[PDB]
Structures are given as structure tokens and as C-alpha cells.
Design a protein around this nucleic acid. Structure first.
Ligand code: MG
Ligand code: MG
Ligand code: MG
Ligand code: MG
Ligand code: MG
Ligand code: MG
Ligand code: MG
Ligand code: MG
Ligand code: MG
Ligand code: MG
Ligand code: MG
Ligand code: MG
Ligand code: MG
Ligand code: MG
Lengths: 225, 128, 125, 53, 187, 147
RNA sequence: CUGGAGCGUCGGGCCCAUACCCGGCCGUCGCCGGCAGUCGAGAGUGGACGGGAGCGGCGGGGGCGGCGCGCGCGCGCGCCCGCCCCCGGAGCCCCGCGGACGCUACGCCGCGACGAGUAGGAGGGCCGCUGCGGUGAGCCUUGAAGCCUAGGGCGCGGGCCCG
RNA sequence: UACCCACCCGACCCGUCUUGAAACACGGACCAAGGAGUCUAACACGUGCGCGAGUCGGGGGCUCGCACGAAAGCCGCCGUG
RNA sequence: AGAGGGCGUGAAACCGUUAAGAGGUAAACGGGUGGGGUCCGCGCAGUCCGCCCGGAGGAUUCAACCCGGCGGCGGGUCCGGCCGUGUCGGCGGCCCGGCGGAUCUUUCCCGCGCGGGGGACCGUCCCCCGACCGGCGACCGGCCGCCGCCGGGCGCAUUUCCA
């Protein structure tokens, strides 16, 4: 009894030091595409512009699929058709931001709220800094901090998403489960832009802060993480 | 060197001052006592600037250190001897206050019972 | 039953006493004057009490019998203990536990007894 | 001024109920005033059906 | 600066019974006990009714508990009711039942027991079947109360036929400006 | 009691649950059921339809004793008489059929609601329904009149 | 105030709200919340009990892996056979044999989340006044109510408590 | 924390009617004491408790000089409604 | 008599003077400090206590053990009896068990078809004993196991007290 049990429960114990090793290993080698793709995607865009330029000839890189949108103005003196979109983008509060999947429907939702937001096609280190530093998840409908990744796996393990790095394909590459990756992900509440805006009111294009800033949103994100 | 507490935490008080009533200063017919001002125009109530502050909730006190005397022992209003033996176990977290209207002879009786069984009394040395 | 009496006696009780944000219970044998289920004397069917001995020295340990209650006179039995602090507690400990008789009070009964003892000795300088 | 679903009500207090209200704090002393008749009449007519003919 | 309506964030469900009757409060206590624990939904629902009001736990009639236990499959189960069972003077072949109720009117008591049935209470049920295994939840008709006929659109609106409240019905007591089409119109 | 009223919670509360724009003035509408045609119309017409007007025919001096006539449904005769008088019969083998004076239990008329148990009866009553007739007949047993 | 402290177009740098971030603390709502005496952390069963046998095993995917493996099954001891034994004692991070100090079972505890307000509602008021039924071996000529106090305090505060 | 005093920043007098009051609108010298949503009938919904195809309440009766009592108890009344 | 003939108490406005501090933007107010006072805690070291332990001093009887007694607790054999739940048997209370029923007999009795009474029936509630089962806080008796108190034994490397 005792020493038929003693063993029986120690097994379970070790059958775990299998398992929580195995997974730990899995994550680590997943993280290893997540280098290799993550590099190969860079070079293979340069690769090709380099290829084009050799002929008398010419890229147009893939249109961006991902554009995290920062709301930049507050919440009073706000039209309706706007305020509804801004709470479909979950940008309720002033000057938080979400990872939005560009898309004829979504792009055209941003036209209509343009004067209040600031979006751009963000870059890896942007996604990283954000998911890492300011990425809490929605678990039982709660802003809960992503400290161990038994919290990600716990919501998203049914999409082959098991760790903080597996989230981060599904957040460039869009992937199949952009939707559900970017909806345990709870809108990222970003501090005031350190060193300050240019002009909250106007299009970037005319010196302001609003709507599209291609690429240049990554200056903006450094200042607000 | 009296009856130390079980635990002496840092007591913090978000505001230490009283909550006087609007214009309790000008008029003598007004007691300092809060009466919440429901004037249409009245400046206090529309929380206006550099006016008297209004007693609101979230500007109230820490659960642990609530209700707690500077030394540590929250009062009991001990009122004869028999009521003192109630604290015999809860001696070290909170103390006896001997009621105003106990007569000098039993004001004594209670005190030396307290000291016998180590319960602080805040007015031990009072009537005499 | 116990659980029922309680609900009558929760509020509305002559040995209950609530001033000044506490509540308390002056009944004979609860240990630590609490308003409670566990630490209440009467409600229940097995009860430990600890209180000072009438002589000035020692501790009496009151144990409810449960042979036949609704029999207040005899329902409910006492014993003196004049020993030397350590054995005094070891007696209460051995009386409650290893007699499986409400091993909840267990410690409270000790803490009481211990507190009783300190109330009876050279009081002060 | 009615508001949203009741009955009509013609309570009849337009006259002067106030003056001519009888309260009944006799009721129990009356009960007894009576008792003493039932009682007395019987003891007076000794052998005779107390109730009446 | 968050831009939610705070209008009905607070939900309005009852989360203790409003009564002070120690026995309800006890068998309620008994299943805060069970309903937290055991997987069975049953005792959530029973909990959620011990809880509810008189007016909103209407009484079951015995007759209706017959035709809810006559049905195919339901033999051998316990009928369970968070409320009262009453008679049906207009029923007679009472089958042998097993019931739970908070109350059972004393005449229903004798009718059930005469048939060699059993009646349980909201504690004995908890020992019989804590998970609610082999049971049948039933309630009385909540759209029963004569009150409920007064409810709806209104009397006087088009072909929506709803009791008006009238001090005393009769010939002269609402039959005119709006019911005979001869006398103004009608609805 | 006084203690458990809103008027306690409305002190320091100036207008007193009653509005300081339009005050609580004495009798704005009128007095009682007043303005039924004019201007309180929308209640009376939408909420008490058929109030305003005559209808029907006078019966003037009228006495209910003249037209006292309670009702019973077949549904529950097998109540009126002590249930043992049914258990006796349903059995017995002679076609007894107990008699039921719906008179004696207090009803000037018997009506055909409900099932009736398969059990022959003699119902003595006053003003029978048709259906009450048919059901009793079709069960077995008879319909006797009383004055 | 004047190659300006004027006016165009522009830089850096800095200053500051009750705005955002992090933290602190006090409200409320929700969590089908946990907690009325129990194992267990992307939990991915557990247990009889038999017959047979043993170093067997379950000799499956650059999957990168998820469900099976390298802290043990069997073993150290008693000596190929037995065992693999009892918590009134394993010595305990799991303990299912009995359970907080904690469990006023309308008590307490963790999460998150949120708490501009006239009229009005609603709730909560060991907030306050006077009356009675209970109850407090309440208090009191060794001094009550009131009254008075630049006498210590407590509540967010109604007030409350103390000199 | 409170008394006086000192400084720095803030700062219009409340109440009210009012689209808008510090109002060059009105009430208001100061203080004590008194002072304004009450009772009843009738509805209605909401809820609490009893019993449940019933259930009641009187008004009557039977049981008190009441100390408590002008109470409580009980009645094919109990259903004449 | 700081109860003096409009006298218990004896507030505020208000005024009476004593002390302190201030004082050209009327006072008065909010936030923040600073100085000073009246008082209030102390300290003529506040070094705060509580375990356990080691050491060195000093002092009583024990604790560990049995044995006599007393009192609990728990266990069961339900052993024996008493108790009550569900079942069965007795048709045994049934008339020595009642009450309810418009059940039935005027085969009965009394009084005038009716009333009262008696007799038959069903539903209910009691005895006998026998059997099963919840064997239930409802005990009570023995046997047990454990605890506590009292009294005996144990004189001191023990077990207490004190510094
Ligand atoms: Mg604006
Ligand atoms: Mg008469
Ligand atoms: Mg208001
Ligand atoms: Mg007004
Ligand atoms: Mg108007
Ligand atoms: Mg608010
Ligand atoms: Mg006007
Ligand atoms: Mg002007
Ligand atoms: Mg005017
Ligand atoms: Mg005097
Ligand atoms: Mg006098
Ligand atoms: Mg005087
Ligand atoms: Mg003066
Ligand atoms: Mg001077």
C-alpha cells in the first residue's frame, strides 16, 4: 500500500518533469523558426529588390497587413459614427492601442476615425516591446498580466499557440488565428509620448499627429512604451 | 513601558483635518458639523477650486489601521468589571476604555483587574 | 440542533454585546468571548470551557457531558487543575485531544488557560 | 390626476366624514356591558330558559 | 477617460433570500454548500430558487405533477419543486409518487402517502441525490396569477385584449365610448 | 412605520422628491376623476375604454336573491360527497350509483366542465347544462330535477 | 520690447492639468469566485482484482512537438523465496484518517475591473432625536442630564468616542 | 487633529426662481428656542409571512373586579358573506 | 449662597475686564508649511516585551512509573436490556382505542316519518408478540481502549519556583 503508492505518485511527479521539460523544449525550438523565418522574411525582401535593381527594374513590396493603431484624442466632443468604430477597435480610453489587421473593411474603418488616431505598419521590435512590456491578456474577462506562459497556452493552446513567442507570429504574420490571438490580447495602455507630440489635431502629412504614419509609428511607440 | 501591541504597523491618514461646513466660519448658527450643500449655484458642491473639500469615500482609511489608536489598541468602552474579562483573550490587539460615568470607587476596581490580567486601559489614572 | 439555535441566537442574545465596532459574547464557556459557531458555549452539544479556580490559584476545565443534555444541572461537568503551568496545559491538551472532543478549541483552551495562569502571580513592581 | 392604470375610484369623502366618525373603543367595554345583562337577566328569572321563550 | 455607459453594469439578481426564516436560510446554506462544489447544474438551479419570492415560485398543483410524471421515461424519478404542492380536488387516481417540496398542503400530504408514495424535504433530497441524479424539476405556472391578465399592451389599443381594472363589473361598468361601435368607436 | 419611509431620506433634500422646476403645487390636473372627456382623455380612452356613456337597459329596483344561481362543474362532484361514497361503489356490483344533492351542498345549477369518472350517478340539481346532461348520461346515470 | 520681447516659415530644449503609465491607498460590480475542512497548477483519471509473465515496456513524427518518458516498476531489506507491513504516527507543500488562527456561513479572501452630478430613485447608514416590550447580577450621592472646556483620539461623516 | 500667529498658492455670498446669478434680481442684522409631506379610505404593483380551491373577520358569542386587560384564549361560529 | 427672596441648571447672540499674538490693501475662506503657546505623552535610559535554549547561582516536591479511588471520553460485542424509523406477523386493542365520514341497519333501544341513543362499515389512531432494517445523541448495563482529578506510593543526573 504505502510503497505501492509512494512510487505511484512519484511517477506522476516525474511523468511531469518529462512533460514540463518536453514543452519547455518545444517552445525553445519553436522560437528557433521564429528566428529563421524572422530573418528569412527580411532578406528575401531585400534579396528581391536587389534582384530587381539589377534589371532596369522594380519592386513594390507587399502591402502591409498589420498596423497597430494608437488612439490620440480624448472622449468628449466626439461624433457617433466615430465613437462606435473607436469601440469596435477597443480604443475606448484615450491613447491606448491595438493590433489591427488591414483589410479593405478595416482600412476603410480607419478613414472614418482618422482625425483621432495614429496608425502605421509596426516592426518586430515594436511588437515585441508591446507584447512583452505591455501585454496583459483577457482571461475570464480580466486584464491579467502575462508573466508565465501557462496563461497564453491556457486560452490559446487549441490554436497551436502555447507561448509568448507563438503569439508573436500570429501578430506579424497575421496567420489563421489573428482574430483570437488579438482578442485574448487586451488593449495596450501606453504612457504619454515622452518628448511630446507635434500636433494632436492635424494629419501627420501636414505636420500633425493623426491617421496614417507609414513605418514612422515606430518612433511613436518607443516614446510611449 | 506599558502593554505593547501584537503588531505596530505604520498608521497613515490620508487627511488629518476636519470637515467643516461651508460658511461655518461667518455664521455662529452653523455648527462645524458637515451638512452637504445642495445649493443650485453653490461653489463648494460643484467641486470648484480652493474651496472647502467635500467628504467623499475614497479618501477614507486603510482597512488594517482603521479605527486604531496611536499606540495600537482600538478601544473597548469597558463599563463595569465583568465587561473587562471579555478582552482576556483579545488583550493584545485592543484595549479598555473606562466609561465616563463610572464612580471613582469602581473606576479603581476595574483598573487593578486590568493590570492583573494585562489589558491596557487608556484612562487608568483618571478620577483619583 | 446546534446550527439552528445559532440562527435564533445570532443577534438577539443577552450575553451578546456590540459596542464600538466589536461584537462579543459573555456567555459561560465560550473561550475568547467570540460571537461564533465554533466558539460558543450553549448552542452546540460538546463544549470546552476554561475559567479561573474559585480559590485564587489554578484553572477549572469545564466539559459538557452529552450523556443527557436538556438537563442543565448535571449536563455539564468540571475539574480543578492546580499544577505547574506546563503540566497544567499538557492536562488540558490531553483532555481535549486524545479524547476527540471538539479538537477545534484545542489551542484556544490552552491560550485561555495560559492567560488565566498569568493573571494569578506576583502582579507588579 | 390619474397616471397609468388604476381604477377610477369615486371615494365618497367630499361631504364631511371628519365630524361624524364613530371610533369603536367602546367595543370591548360594550362586550362587557352586554355580558352583565345576559348574566343579570338569567339570575333574576332564575329557573327560566336564559335564552328566551 | 473611459467611455462605457455605467447604466446597467450592476446586475440585479437575488443573491440571498430576502426572508428571515431560519430554515430557508439553513437549506440555503446547505447549498451555497453543494452548488459551489458539485458539477451538477440542478443544485445551482435549486439554489437559485430557494432564493426567489413567493410570487415567483408559484405553487404546483398535484394534478399537474401527475401529467409531468406520467410522461415516457420519467417513471422512478423524484419530482422536485422549490415551492408548494397543493391538491387537485378534480383528480383521483393518484399514482404513487416521490416528491420534494418546501411545503405540501396537508390534504396533498395525506393523498400522496395514502397511495404509498414518499415525500422528501430539501435536506433529505440532498442525501438521496446530492447531484440531482434521477430527478425532475417542476414549477407552477408563473403566468398564473390573476395579476398577469392586467399585463401587456392596454385595453383601448387595437385588438389587444387585456383586463382593465374596474371597481365592479356589470352592465354599466365599462361598455360605451370605445366598446360598442355604435357608441363612438371600438377596440 | 415612520422610520422606514423615503421622507426620512429626503431631509436636507430641498424640493423633497418633487422637483424644483415645477413644484409640488396643490392640484394641477383637477380634483379626482375630472377631465375625463377633456384633456385627461388619453388615459380614460386608452386605459379604461368604454367608460363614457350609457348602454343597455334598466332593471330598476333590482334584487340578487331573485336571480341567485351558483354553479358547479362535473369536474368536482366527486368532492361534494365524502370520497368513501365513491370508493363504495366502483365496486359493489349492483349498480348502486350514489345520489348527489347539489342542492344540499349549495348550488342552484350544475355545469359540464371536465372529465367525469366512469361511475354511474344520480345528480339531483336545479338548472342543469346540456353538456352536463350528456356527460352524466354517457357515463351512466341520470339527471333528476329539483324545485 | 526695436539687428527686437514686432511679423512669416522652421529647429532643438524645456514648462505644466483632476488627461495617460507605474505604483500607493479608500469606494462599487463581477467573477455561474474561493474559501463550511481537501491536492493540485497549458492536468491529460484513479482504483480494484484476477490469470500470465519481466527488464517489459507502447521499439508511433527535423516533429521540431503537443500522449507518454528518463528519479526507479523491482526493490532495499528479510534471503532463488517473502515482503513491498500500522500516520495515534509520513513527520509533514499534500496528506482524501481530522481539520484556519479564519468559519458573526448575511463571516472573511483574491482576482480583475471600474466609482463628473443638478431633479429623481434606489441602497446603505454600532448616523442622530424622543416613547415602549425585551435584555444588558448596565451605570448613579464614591455624583446623572445638561452644561462648559487653545484636555487624547476615531470615522470618509451623521457623529462618535475619551481629558 | 484643534488656538494664536506667520507665510506661499487658491478664492465673489449663501438660498432661490432661473437658457444664464457675485448680480446694478429677490429673502437673509445676530442669537436662541418653535417650524413644513402628516393620518384615514380606496385602489394598484412590489415584497414578507400563514393556510391553500380556500382563506379569512367581523360583527357577534362563550371565558373579568383587568393590575398586566380595555389584552389573550376559544366558537356545528367558521360561514349567514 | 459660583442655591440669596423673579433664588435649581444656567447656553448663544451679546456684552464685562485679565493674558498672548497680531494688525497700511475690510474682514472672513481653501491648499501648503513655519514660530509660539496652552495643555497632553514622557524619560531623571523608553531601551519595549513574550518563547525556547545554554551557562552560573539559589529554592520547594515532582513529574516518568506503578497501586487504591473517583470522574470523563471514545469503541465496539447492539452482548444484555430500554428506545424509536421503515417492513412483516398477530386482527391481537378493534366492545376492555378514540374520532371523522351525507358509509349502513328504523333486524336494535329511548323519545317524539324525524330527533336522541345504541348496534354494523371505511378511513384513521393502540396492545401482543414474532422477523428484517435505519441501530438512529435515546439510553442503560457490562467488557474494553484512552484521558483527567483525587489519594497512595517513588527523595532527586529527576520535575518544578526564583533571580
Ligand atoms: Mg473638446
Ligand atoms: Mg337572544
Ligand atoms: Mg438630489
Ligand atoms: Mg422649491
Ligand atoms: Mg414649466
Ligand atoms: Mg458619484
Ligand atoms: Mg416661474
Ligand atoms: Mg448687473
Ligand atoms: Mg420675487
Ligand atoms: Mg445651586
Ligand atoms: Mg431638588
Ligand atoms: Mg442661577
Ligand atoms: Mg470675553
Ligand atoms: Mg493685550
Amino acid at each position: 500500500n504505502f510503497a505501492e503508492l509512494k512510487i505511484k505518485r512519484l511517477r506522476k511527479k516525474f511523468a511531469q518533469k518529462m512533460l514540463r521539460k518536453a514543452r519547455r523544449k518545444l517552445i525553445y525550438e519553436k522560437a528557433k523558426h521564429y528566428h529563421k523565418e524572422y530573418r528569412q522574411m527580411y532578406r528575401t525582401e531585400i534579396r528581391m529588390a536587389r534582384m530587381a535593381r539589377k534589371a532596369g527594374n522594380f519592386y513594390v513590396p507587399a502591402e502591409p497587413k498589420l498596423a497597430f493603431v494608437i488612439r490620440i484624442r480624448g472622449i468628449n466632443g466626439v461624433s457617433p459614427k466615430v465613437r462606435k468604430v473607436l469601440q469596435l477597435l477597443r480604443l475606448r480610453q484615450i491613447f491606448n492601442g491595438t493590433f489591427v489587421k488591414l483589410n479593405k473593411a478595416s482600412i476603410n474603418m480607419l478613414r472614418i476615425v482618422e482625425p483621432y488616431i495614429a496608425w502605421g505598419y509596426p516592426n518586430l521590435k515594436s511588437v515585441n516591446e508591446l507584447i512583452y512590456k505591455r501585454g496583459y491578456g483577457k482571461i475570464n474577462k480580466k486584464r491579467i498580466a502575462l508573466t508565465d506562459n501557462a496563461l497564453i497556452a491556457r486560452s490559446l493552446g487549441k490554436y497551436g499557440i502555447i507561448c509568448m513567442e507563438d503569439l508573436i507570429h500570429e501578430i506579424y504574420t497575421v496567420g489563421k488565428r489573428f482574430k483570437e490571438a488579438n482578442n485574448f490580447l487586451w488593449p495596450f495602455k501606453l504612457s504619454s509620448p515622452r518628448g511630446g507630440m507635434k500636433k494632436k489635431t492635424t494629419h501627420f502629412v501636414e505636420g500633425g499627429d493623426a491617421g496614417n504614419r507609414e513605418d514612422q509609428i515606430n518612433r511613436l511607440i518607443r516614446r510611449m512604451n | 513601558a506599558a502593554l505593547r501591541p501584537l503588531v505596530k504597523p505604520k498608521i497613515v491618514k490620508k487627511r488629518t483635518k476636519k470637515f467643516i461646513r461651508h460658511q461655518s466660519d461667518r455664521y455662529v448658527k452653523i455648527k462645524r458639523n458637515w451638512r452637504k450643500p445642495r445649493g443650485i449655484d453653490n461653489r463648494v458642491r460643484r467641486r470648484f477650486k480652493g474651496q472647502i473639500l467635500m467628504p467623499n469615500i475614497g479618501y477614507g482609511s486603510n482597512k488594517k489601521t482603521k479605527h486604531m489608536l496611536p499606540s495600537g489598541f482600538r478601544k473597548f468602552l469597558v463599563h463595569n468589571v465583568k465587561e473587562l474579562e471579555v478582552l482576556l483573550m483579545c488583550n493584545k490587539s485592543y484595549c479598555a476604555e473606562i466609561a465616563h460615568n463610572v464612580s471613582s470607587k469602581n473606576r479603581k476596581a476595574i483598573v487593578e483587574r486590568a493590570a492583573q490580567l494585562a489589558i491596557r486601559v487608556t484612562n487608568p489614572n483618571a478620577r483619583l | 440542533s446546534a446550527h439552528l439555535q445559532w440562527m435564533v441566537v445570532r443577534n438577539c442574545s443577552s450575553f451578546l454585546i456590540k459596542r464600538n465596532k466589536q461584537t462579543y459574547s459573555t456567555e459561560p464557556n465560550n473561550l475568547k468571548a467570540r460571537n461564533s459557531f465554533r466558539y460558543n458555549g450553549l448552542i452546540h452539544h460538546k463544549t470546552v470551557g476554561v475559567e479561573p479556580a474559585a480559590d485564587g490559584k489554578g484553572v477549572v476545565v469545564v466539559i459538557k457531558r452529552r450523556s443527557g443534555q436538556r438537563k442543565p444541572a448535571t449536563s455539564y461537568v468540571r475539574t480543578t487543575i492546580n499544577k505547574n503551568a506546563r503540566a497544567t496545559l499538557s492536562s488540558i491538551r490531553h483532555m481535549i485531544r486524545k479524547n476527540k472532543y471538539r479538537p477545534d478549541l484545542r489551542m484556544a483552551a490552552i491560550r485561555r488557560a495560559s492567560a488565566i495562569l498569568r493573571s494569578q502571580k506576583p502582579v507588579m513592581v | 390626476a390619474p397616471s397609468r392604470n388604476g381604477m377610477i375610484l369615486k371615494p365618497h369623502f367630499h361631504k364631511d366624514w371628519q365630524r361624524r366618525v364613530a371610533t369603536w373603543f367602546n367595543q370591548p367595554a360594550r362586550k362587557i356591558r352586554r355580558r352583565k345583562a345576559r348574566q343579570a337577566k338569567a339570575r333574576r328569572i332564575a329557573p327560566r330558559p336564559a335564552s328566551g321563550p | 477617460g473611459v467611455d462605457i455607459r455605467h447604466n446597467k453594469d450592476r446586475k440585479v439578481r437575488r443573491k440571498e433570500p430576502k426572508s428571515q426564516d431560519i430554515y430557508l436560510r439553513l437549506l440555503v446554506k446547505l447549498y451555497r454548500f453543494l452548488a459551489r462544489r458539485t458539477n451538477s447544474t440542478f443544485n445551482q438551479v435549486v439554489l437559485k430558487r430557494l432564493f426567489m419570492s413567493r410570487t415567483n415560485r408559484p405553487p404546483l398543483s398535484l394534478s399537474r405533477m401527475i401529467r409531468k410524471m406520467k410522461l415516457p421515461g420519467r417513471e422512478g424519478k423524484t419530482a422536485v419543486v422549490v415551492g408548494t404542492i397543493t391538491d387537485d380536488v378534480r383528480v383521483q387516481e393518484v399514482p404513487k409518487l416521490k416528491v420534494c417540496a418546501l411545503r405540501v398542503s396537508s390534504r396533498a400530504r395525506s393523498r400522496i402517502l395514502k397511495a404509498g408514495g414518499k415525500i422528501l424535504t430539501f435536506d433529505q433530497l440532498a442525501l438521496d441525490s446530492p447531484k440531482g441524479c434521477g430527478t425532475v424539476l417542476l414549477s407552477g405556472p408563473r403566468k398564473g396569477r390573476e395579476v398577469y391578465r392586467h399585463f401587456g399592451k392596454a385595453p383601448g389599443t387595437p385588438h389587444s385584449h387585456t383586463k382593465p381594472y374596474v371597481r365592479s363589473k356589470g352592465r354599466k361598468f365599462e361598455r360605451a365610448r370605445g366598446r360598442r361601435a355604435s357608441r363612438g368607436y371600438k377596440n | 412605520p415612520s422610520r422606514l419611509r423615503k421622507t426620512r431620506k429626503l431631509r436636507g433634500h430641498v424640493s423633497h422628491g418633487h422637483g424644483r422646476i415645477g413644484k409640488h403645487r396643490k392640484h394641477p390636473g383637477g380634483r379626482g376623476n375630472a377631465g375625463g372627456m377633456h384633456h385627461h382623455r388619453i388615459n380614460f380612452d386608452k386605459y379604461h375604454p368604454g367608460y363614457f356613456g350609457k348602454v343597455g337597459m334598466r332593471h330598476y329596483h333590482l334584487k340578487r336573491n331573485q336571480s341567485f344561481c351558483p354553479t358547479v362543474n362535473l369536474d368536482k362532484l366527486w368532492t361534494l360527497v365524502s370520497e368513501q361514497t365513491r370508493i363504495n361503489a366502483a365496486k359493489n356490483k349492483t349498480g348502486a350509483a350514489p345520489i348527489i344533492d347539489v342542492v344540499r351542498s349549495g348550488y342552484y345549477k350544475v355545469l359540464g366542465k371536465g372529465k367525469l369518472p366512469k361511475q354511474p350517478v344520480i345528480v339531483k340539481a336545479k338548472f342543469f347544462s346540456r353538456r352536463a346532461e350528456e356527460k352524466i348520461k354517457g357515463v351512466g346515470g341520470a339527471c333528476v330535477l329539483v324545485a
